[PDB]
Structure 1
Amino acid sequence: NLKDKILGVAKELFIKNGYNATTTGEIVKLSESSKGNLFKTKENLFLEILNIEESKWQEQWKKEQIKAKTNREKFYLYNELSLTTEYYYPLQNAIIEFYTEYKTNSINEKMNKLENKYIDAYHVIFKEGNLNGEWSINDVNAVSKIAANAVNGIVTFTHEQNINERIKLMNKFSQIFLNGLS
């Protein structure tokens, strides 16, 4: 598929090099296509990929959260898998570089849904954890944001060391966090 071949190449460059490094010229180069083809704007093509990868990851979580009976377990598992997936999280460096370039209102709103789809996972976990009586979170939305970000950090800023120690820290985190929720 040509349209999904650009989506393919781009994603690659966006991960390897940054959002800046990757240029519309290259995307075309390694695609045997042409500017005339493209996906009008670059930030358009990019946010497209974010959506995809966001969805791919969210789905996998589902076809996977099954192995977790308690929401406490759900929390741990989500944080762990974050470290191993091949979806969304491998693009954080790129996302960051992008964000530092949030002025055009047609963005923070065009991403307001990407922001929530990313914290939802934790929303469900925390809320249903209240429904299931595993803890007592008043400010759910907050904790969800707090967690989504703390985790994204452990995942993003330690991507330079034994993948198994990361999983160890990450688990110690989940431990620490949930223990503090009451």
Structure 2
Amino acid sequence: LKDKILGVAKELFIKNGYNATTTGEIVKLSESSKGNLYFKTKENLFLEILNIEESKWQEQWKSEQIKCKTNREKFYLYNELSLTTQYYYPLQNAIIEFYTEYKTNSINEKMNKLENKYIDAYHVIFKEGNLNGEWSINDVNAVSKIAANAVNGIVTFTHEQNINERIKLMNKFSQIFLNGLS
């Protein structure tokens, strides 16, 4: 079908790189043709998968974040869940590889809002945290970008070692980060 493609494309982009998987591989792997595949281009197809996963993850987060009473806990839990989740973070190396290629100003308007979904989770947390008076952050957008990028760092660059080690580190991080604010 049409959305037999998006599922296989996703799995290819994870299995191999952005560059390593091509429009020939995906079309061949879905019993289709370039007529079918023509989405616009590879860059769009990819960027649409990015859209799906980023939503799926933020939705999974919203249906799991009630378990965090304070925002201070929401920070730990969000970063913690990021290690375990099935969404978005498994596409990160392809996202790294993708940035180095496309540069092109046509598509990078779309990178502006998808870079802002990525950080909004923290923005909500730090803003609602200043409303709740758990901390005094004057520079939230700065901090939201930092925390987001740190965490993706730990998730991505530790994807090999034991999952409890990873979860241990990530929690020690959140502890050191939040303590840094006060």
1:43-65 deviation digits (Å, cap 9, x = unpaired): 01000000000000000000000
1:114-148 deviation digits (Å, cap 9, x = unpaired): 00000000000000000000000000000000000
SS at match of 1:164: helix
Identity %: 98
Give the aligned CA root-mean-square deviation in angstroms.
0.6
- How far residue 109 of structure 1 moved from its aligned partner, in angstroms, is 1.2
1:16-45 deviation digits (Å, cap 9, x = unpaired): 100000000010111000111111200010
1:92-116 deviation digits (Å, cap 9, x = unpaired): 0000000001411122211100000
Distance, in Å, in 2 between the alignment partners of 1:150 and 1:28 is 36
What residue ranges of structure 1 are gaps of 5+ in the alignment?
none
- How far residue 3 of structure 1 moved from its aligned partner, in angstroms, is 1.7
Distance, in Å, in 2 between the alignment partners of 1:102 and 1:75 is 32
TM-score by length of 1: 0.98
Distance, in Å, in 2 between the alignment partners of 1:40 and 1:136 is 46
Distance, in Å, in 2 between the alignment partners of 1:106 and 1:150 is 28
Match of 1:90 in 2: 90
- How far residue 78 of structure 1 moved from its aligned partner, in angstroms, is 0.2
Distance, in Å, in 2 between the alignment partners of 1:63 and 1:157 is 27
- Which structure shows the bigger proportion of residues in helix conformation? 2
TM-score by length of 2: 0.98
Dislocated runs of 4+, deviation >3 Å: none
